[PDB]
Scaffold this motif. Structure first.
Motif, PDB file in Angstrom:
ATOM      1  N   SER A 155      35.622  39.382   3.405  1.00  0.00           N
ATOM      2  CA  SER A 155      35.762  40.791   3.706  1.00  0.00           C
ATOM      3  C   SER A 155      37.130  41.054   4.369  1.00  0.00           C
ATOM      4  N   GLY A 156      37.567  40.137   5.235  1.00  0.00           N
ATOM      5  CA  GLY A 156      38.849  40.349   5.900  1.00  0.00           C
ATOM      6  C   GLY A 156      39.946  40.312   4.873  1.00  0.00           C
ATOM      7  N   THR A 157      39.798  39.349   3.941  1.00  0.00           N
ATOM      8  CA  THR A 157      40.779  39.163   2.878  1.00  0.00           C
ATOM      9  C   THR A 157      40.930  40.427   2.026  1.00  0.00           C
ATOM     10  N   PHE A 158      39.791  40.990   1.638  1.00  0.00           N
ATOM     11  CA  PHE A 158      39.707  42.206   0.827  1.00  0.00           C
ATOM     12  C   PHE A 158      40.430  43.375   1.531  1.00  0.00           C
ATOM     13  N   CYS A 159      40.176  43.584   2.817  1.00  0.00           N
ATOM     14  CA  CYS A 159      40.711  44.757   3.473  1.00  0.00           C
ATOM     15  C   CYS A 159      42.196  44.523   3.835  1.00  0.00           C
ATOM     16  N   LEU A 160      42.524  43.281   4.168  1.00  0.00           N
ATOM     17  CA  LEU A 160      43.867  42.925   4.518  1.00  0.00           C
ATOM     18  C   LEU A 160      44.789  43.110   3.315  1.00  0.00           C
ATOM     19  N   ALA A 161      44.356  42.584   2.184  1.00  0.00           N
ATOM     20  CA  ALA A 161      45.123  42.771   0.986  1.00  0.00           C
ATOM     21  C   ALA A 161      45.231  44.244   0.634  1.00  0.00           C
ATOM     22  N   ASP A 162      44.116  44.969   0.574  1.00  0.00           N
ATOM     23  CA  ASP A 162      44.193  46.410   0.270  1.00  0.00           C
ATOM     24  C   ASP A 162      45.210  47.191   1.152  1.00  0.00           C
ATOM     25  N   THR A 163      45.115  47.008   2.467  1.00  0.00           N
ATOM     26  CA  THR A 163      45.879  47.742   3.422  1.00  0.00           C
ATOM     27  C   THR A 163      47.378  47.404   3.321  1.00  0.00           C
ATOM     28  N   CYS A 164      47.713  46.113   3.196  1.00  0.00           N
ATOM     29  CA  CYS A 164      49.110  45.688   3.109  1.00  0.00           C
ATOM     30  C   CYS A 164      49.727  46.290   1.826  1.00  0.00           C
ATOM     31  N   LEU A 165      48.993  46.234   0.689  1.00  0.00           N
ATOM     32  CA  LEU A 165      49.512  46.771  -0.567  1.00  0.00           C
ATOM     33  C   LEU A 165      49.735  48.288  -0.431  1.00  0.00           C
ATOM     34  N   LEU A 166      48.831  48.992   0.237  1.00  0.00           N
ATOM     35  CA  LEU A 166      48.994  50.429   0.393  1.00  0.00           C
ATOM     36  C   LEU A 166      50.265  50.741   1.213  1.00  0.00           C
ATOM     37  N   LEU A 167      50.431  50.029   2.334  1.00  0.00           N
ATOM     38  CA  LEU A 167      51.590  50.179   3.220  1.00  0.00           C
ATOM     39  C   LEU A 167      52.873  49.864   2.490  1.00  0.00           C
ATOM     40  N   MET A 168      52.852  48.875   1.590  1.00  0.00           N
ATOM     41  CA  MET A 168      54.046  48.559   0.834  1.00  0.00           C
ATOM     42  C   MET A 168      54.401  49.735  -0.094  1.00  0.00           C
ATOM     43  N   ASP A 169      53.422  50.524  -0.488  1.00  0.00           N
ATOM     44  CA  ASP A 169      53.668  51.643  -1.375  1.00  0.00           C
ATOM     45  C   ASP A 169      54.086  52.848  -0.604  1.00  0.00           C
ATOM     46  N   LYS A 170      53.752  52.893   0.658  1.00  0.00           N
ATOM     47  CA  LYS A 170      54.044  54.096   1.367  1.00  0.00           C
ATOM     48  C   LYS A 170      55.282  54.037   2.246  1.00  0.00           C
ATOM     49  N   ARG A 171      55.680  52.849   2.693  1.00  0.00           N
ATOM     50  CA  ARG A 171      56.845  52.680   3.572  1.00  0.00           C
ATOM     51  C   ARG A 171      58.179  52.765   2.824  1.00  0.00           C
ATOM     52  N   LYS A 172      59.202  53.285   3.514  1.00  0.00           N
ATOM     53  CA  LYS A 172      60.593  53.336   3.027  1.00  0.00           C
ATOM     54  C   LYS A 172      61.100  51.916   2.739  1.00  0.00           C
ATOM     55  N   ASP A 173      60.751  50.972   3.639  1.00  0.00           N
ATOM     56  CA  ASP A 173      61.092  49.552   3.461  1.00  0.00           C
ATOM     57  C   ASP A 173      59.813  48.699   3.264  1.00  0.00           C
ATOM     58  N   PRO A 174      59.448  48.417   2.015  1.00  0.00           N
ATOM     59  CA  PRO A 174      58.244  47.596   1.711  1.00  0.00           C
ATOM     60  C   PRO A 174      58.251  46.195   2.368  1.00  0.00           C
ATOM     61  N   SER A 175      59.427  45.580   2.467  1.00  0.00           N
ATOM     62  CA  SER A 175      59.593  44.247   3.052  1.00  0.00           C
ATOM     63  C   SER A 175      59.355  44.258   4.577  1.00  0.00           C
ATOM     64  N   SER A 176      59.235  45.434   5.205  1.00  0.00           N
ATOM     65  CA  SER A 176      58.844  45.471   6.592  1.00  0.00           C
ATOM     66  C   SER A 176      57.314  45.196   6.814  1.00  0.00           C
ATOM     67  N   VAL A 177      56.539  45.152   5.741  1.00  0.00           N
ATOM     68  CA  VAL A 177      55.054  44.977   5.902  1.00  0.00           C
ATOM     69  C   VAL A 177      54.754  43.534   6.364  1.00  0.00           C
ATOM     70  N   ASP A 178      54.201  43.385   7.548  1.00  0.00           N
ATOM     71  CA  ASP A 178      54.016  42.054   8.100  1.00  0.00           C
ATOM     72  C   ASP A 178      52.499  41.737   8.104  1.00  0.00           C
ATOM     73  N   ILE A 179      52.065  40.824   7.244  1.00  0.00           N
ATOM     74  CA  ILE A 179      50.651  40.542   7.055  1.00  0.00           C
ATOM     75  C   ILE A 179      49.988  40.076   8.335  1.00  0.00           C
ATOM     76  N   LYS A 180      50.731  39.327   9.134  1.00  0.00           N
ATOM     77  CA  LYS A 180      50.149  38.769  10.340  1.00  0.00           C
ATOM     78  C   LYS A 180      49.856  39.873  11.331  1.00  0.00           C
ATOM     79  N   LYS A 181      50.767  40.824  11.399  1.00  0.00           N
ATOM     80  CA  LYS A 181      50.645  41.937  12.288  1.00  0.00           C
ATOM     81  C   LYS A 181      49.490  42.872  11.820  1.00  0.00           C
ATOM     82  N   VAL A 182      49.348  43.065  10.513  1.00  0.00           N
ATOM     83  CA  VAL A 182      48.219  43.882  10.020  1.00  0.00           C
ATOM     84  C   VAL A 182      46.921  43.174  10.301  1.00  0.00           C
TER      85      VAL A 182
END
Length: 280
Positions: A221-248
């Motif tokens: 379940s953590g994997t599912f939500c972590l992946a979903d959320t990081c992918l969404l943030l990569m689509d919404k942020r000006k800088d996709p490479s700023s998405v830090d999986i550990k921090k999410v």
């Protein structure tokens, strides 16, 4: 990318150390309600409990307790309820939660039996002519249709509140090929499954939070939500490479303990986000 971080951790063989550091930094909050004597039989695992501050409350004067947490991801504008697989005695609570929280989807990431042991109750009907009635919470549940694919099954279920006779359609997204041991070799099927859930509307703000579970409701379940959320943030942020999986992951851990249960699950989440980003 986080791809260079990934490749480095691999070369260094440092997954265990990265993972352990996450565990050391994870939030610790009280779970007093979960630990109350009357709730012992509402918990599958003594070491997996919802925090008081983020727990889902049943709308019931008697015992409002279920082992489930609301994970609210403010920036990504996504919310998820993560819960354990229902127990023989918490199937009525589970569907009561789905009803009251106005969920559209349930995401089930385990088989009812794995490794020769029962990982959850058979909480939904397997034949359309044999509905289930949950007498304790006054709900009727009916299988409307079932579509079995090679890596997942989707069911339409009709949930009826017997007190008001209101009826809702619930989609059941059942990922059926996560291996008994370890993680999938490739994130392709899991990603495909995540996109199928998104496509249904189940994760969308017009509905209550999706309910996600496996046996304990933290690992897959953590994997599912972590992946979903990081992918969404990569689509919404000006800088996709700023998405830090550990921090999410640590932000999610503020709402439910123990999300991502092994270093191999951590590695797999990175692989899923990396390949999913290359697809989007």
């Amino acid at each position: 990318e986080m791809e260079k971080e990934f490749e480095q951790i691999d070369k260094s063989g440092s997954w265990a150390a990265i993972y352990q550091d996450i565990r050391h930094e994870a939030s610790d909050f009280p779970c007093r309600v979960a630990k109350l004597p009357k709730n012992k039989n509402r918990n599958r695992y003594r070491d997996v409990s919802p925090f008081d501050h983020s727990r889902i409350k049943l709308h019931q004067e008697d015992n409002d307790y279920i082992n489930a947490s609301l994970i609210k991801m403010e920036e990504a504008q996504r919310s998820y309820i993560l819960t354990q697989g229902p127990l023989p005695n918490t199937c009525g609570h589970f569907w009561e939660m789905v009803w009251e929280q106005k969920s559209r989807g349930v995401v089930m990431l385990n088989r009812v039996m794995e490794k020769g042991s029962l990982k959850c109750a058979q909480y939904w009907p397997q034949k359309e002519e044999k509905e289930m009635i949950f007498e304790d919470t006054n709900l009727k549940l009916t299988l409307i249709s079932e579509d079995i694919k090679s890596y997942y099954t989707v069911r339409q279920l009709e949930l009826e509140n017997l007190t008001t006779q209101e009826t809702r359609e619930i989609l059941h997204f059942h990922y059926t090929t996560w291996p008994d041991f370890g993680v999938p070799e490739s994130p392709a099927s899991f990603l495909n499954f995540l996109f199928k859930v998104r496509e249904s509307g189940s994760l969308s703000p017009e509905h209550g939070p999706v309910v996600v579970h496996c046996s304990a409701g933290i690992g897959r379940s953590g994997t599912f939500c972590l992946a979903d959320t990081c992918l969404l943030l990569m689509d919404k942020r000006k800088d996709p490479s700023s998405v830090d999986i550990k921090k999410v992951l640590l932000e999610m851990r503020k709402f439910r303990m123990g999300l991502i249960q092994t270093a191999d699950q951590l590695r797999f989440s990175y692989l899923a986000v990396i390949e999913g980003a290359k697809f989007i």
